């Protein structure tokens, strides 16, 4: 992965302004709601029985926080993803048994969340970088199936 100069300055040019918890609780909240089946992995989280029930659960919300917090670790070292995500590609593969197709959904949902917030600031170039991001992380997440 060859990172360009304006591709970094942007990633982090946006990150700095990110609400990890707020953005954090949505994407995950939008995921559980958006694609229902993914609620299979979070049953221990308790109530996920209604759109409402979900946007209110403090677990999902809590965890939502360390998810896009981890993407931050993705941003801060845009060169060592396959590593900072080696440990976490095991859990998702040998323990939770989550289909790769679902690391990509969450990524397409991070971007819908990022833009909703930053409205016009999230320029196409902006988007290009950040879709290239979720595609990488996403990738580094599955390397442990291969």
């Amino acid at each position: 992965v060859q990172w360009s100069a304006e591709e970094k300055q942007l990633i982090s040019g946006l990150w700095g302004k990110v609400n990890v918890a707020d953005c954090g609780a949505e994407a995950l909240a939008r995921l559980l709601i958006v694609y229902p089946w993914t609620q299979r992995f979070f049953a221990s989280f308790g109530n996920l029985s209604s759109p409402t029930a979900i946007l209110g659960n403090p677990m999902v919300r809590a965890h939502g926080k360390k998810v896009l917090t981890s993407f931050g670790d993705a941003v801060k070292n845009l060169d060592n993803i396959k590593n900072t995500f080696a440990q976490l590609s095991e859990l998702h593969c040998d323990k939770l048994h989550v289909d790769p197709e679902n690391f990509r959904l969450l990524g397409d949902i991070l971007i819908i969340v990022l833009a909703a917030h930053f409205t016009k600031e999230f320029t196409p170039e902006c988007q290009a970088a950040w879709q290239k991001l979720v595609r990488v992380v996403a990738h580094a997440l599955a390397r442990k199936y291969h």
Partner: protein, 141 residues
């Protein structure tokens, strides 16, 4: 398919378009050119320079069908089906892009109608686009 909740939301959100059909489909097909370049391959005859006269005209084409559809939400097929023989028989759009475009559209909306694209409107809106794409490709099945 789409639900009582569903239909009413796609509609409620297609009301707050608005007449913006033009720029919206337009900004959506552009975004889809940069974010996803591989998608340019289908438009060799097309000029793809920001604000290219053409992308303009095709964008109000693409936009006017999504609406068209929204109106007859209860029988989509015969509504876009005609766009079926085009995409499938002639164009041979890789059933994967239909997702990319749907993503850029649901991005455009989310930039202008933030408070209105809530969790539940995100969903339905995605339900809708999925039959829309499920219809234009039918000729595959």
């Amino acid at each position: 398919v789409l639900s009582g909740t569903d239909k009413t939301n796609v509609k409620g959100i297609f009301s707050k378009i608005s007449s913006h059909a033009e720029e919206y489909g337009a900004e959506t097909l552009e975004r889809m050119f940069i974010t996803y370049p591989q998608t340019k391959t289908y438009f060799p005859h097309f000029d793809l320079h920001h604000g290219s006269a053409q992308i303009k005209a095709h964008g109000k084409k693409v936009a006017n069908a999504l609406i068209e559809a929204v109106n007859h939400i209860d029988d989509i097929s015969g509504a876009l089906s005609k766009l079926s023989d085009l995409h499938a028989q002639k164009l041979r759009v890789d059933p994967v892009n239909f997702k990319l475009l749907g993503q850029c559209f649901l991005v455009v909306v989310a930039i202008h109608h933030p408070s209105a694209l809530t969790p539940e409107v995100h969903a339905s809106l995605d339900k809708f686009l999925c039959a829309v794409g499920a219809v234009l490709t039918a000729k595959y099945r």
